[PDB]
Design a protein around this ligand. Structure first.
Ligand SMILES: [Mn+2]
Ligand SMILES: [Mn+2]
Ligand code: NA
Ligand code: NA
Length: 327
DNA sequence: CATTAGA
DNA sequence: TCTAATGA
């Protein structure tokens, strides 16, 4: 956690680089389990060899270890850090809609800068066009103060659309957080559940309304169960216009709402920990259900969940407010 | 680990 | 169809 710090961090630097700049899924994968392992180790790695005794740690990495311990640095890390091509890929990759693959191509063609990006809006798809358009707003955190005004608006129209609609802003916001990255609304309807052959309009009606009133301003992707766009709160009686924010609204089979809701509310740890508990308690929890475990090794049979509670109860735990779902 | 775009 | 990119 701090004892193998630099070690794992160097390791991750390297991993990550193999994956984006180079198209070496393997090495990238190598660097990572080793990083993963030296990370667990209970004592201060004092050399290549010591580390070497580890699984995943071979000669190659052990080697990097010494040089890193030896001189507090790594040549390869210095070179890469310098390396313009890779620098570029690392950066282009920041535009929503651009991945490593595309990052490579752009550079290939010689598109290294945001402006390069601009002079060539054409080579870019919609997603990317939008991502470039709000590069600034996308990079900014969402102040909770605003999260409250967004949540406010969203829930209104929702209800005004159909009243039988259930929405929940999930995520960190849900759990207290002063700021959030993007806004995540979990949606459901009674009319939609596990079987009942859908009702796409369900998601559809909603976006339409939000756009209608001018909250959704763009669409990155809109499908039958997961909408992905851009919103913005109404630049007041002017002077202060608001930033463009990322919004994600997803339809849920009413019969899996809370599991989902449970899930997206995180945190990654609480989740795990919670998930880990249901296991002993004779269960299983996944993004949508909670199944009673059977002795044959496994078993199924989706228990009825009506609120975050039921879930709790099932595993016979203390209902935890979102606020304290921290771990 | 699953949903959408896109070519 | 597959392949990329998001998320989470
Ligand atoms: Mn989010
Ligand atoms: Mn999101
Ligand atoms: Na990106
Ligand atoms: Na393949």
């Amino acid at each position: 956690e701090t004892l193998n710090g630099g070690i794992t961090d160097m390791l991750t630097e390297l991993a990550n680089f193999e994956k984006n700049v180079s198209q070496a899924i393997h090495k990238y994968n190598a660097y990572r389990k080793a990083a993963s392992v030296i990370a667990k180790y209970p004592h201060k790695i004092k050399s290549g060899a010591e580390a070497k005794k580890l699984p995943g740690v071979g000669t190659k990495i052990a080697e990097k270890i010494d040089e890193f311990l030896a001189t507090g640095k790594l040549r390869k890390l210095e070179k890469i850090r310098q390396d313009d091509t890779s620098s570029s890929i690392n950066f282009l990759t920041r535009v929503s809609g651009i991945g490593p693959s595309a990052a490579r191509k752009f550079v290939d063609e010689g598109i290294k800068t945001l402006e390069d990006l601009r002079k060539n809006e054409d080579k870019l798809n919609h997603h990317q066009r939008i991502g470039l358009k709000y590069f600034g707003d996308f990079e900014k955190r969402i102040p909770r103060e605003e999260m409250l005004q967004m949540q406010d608006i969203v829930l209104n129209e929702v209800k005004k659309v159909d009243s039988e609609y259930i929405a929940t802003v999930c995520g960190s916001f849900r759990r207290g957080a002063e700021s959030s990255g993007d806004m995540d609304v979990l949606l459901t309807h009674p009319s939609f559940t596990s079987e009942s052959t859908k009702q796409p309009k369900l998601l559809h009606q909603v976006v339409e309304q939000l756009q209608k009133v001018h909250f959704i301003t763009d669409t990155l992707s809109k499908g039958e169960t997961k909408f992905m766009g851009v919103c913005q709160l109404p630049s007041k009686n002017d002077e202060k216009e608001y930033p463009h924010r990322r919004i994600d609204i997803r339809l849920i089979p009413k019969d899996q709402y809370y599991c989902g809701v449970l899930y997206f509310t995180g945190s990654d740890i609480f989740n795990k920990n919670m998930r880990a508990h249901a296991l002993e308690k004779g269960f299983t929890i996944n993004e949508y259900t909670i199944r009673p475990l059977g002795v044959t090794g496994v078993a199924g049979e989706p228990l009825p969940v009506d609120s975050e509670k039921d879930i709790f109860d099932y595993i016979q735990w203390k209902y935890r407010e979102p606020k304290d779902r921290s771990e």
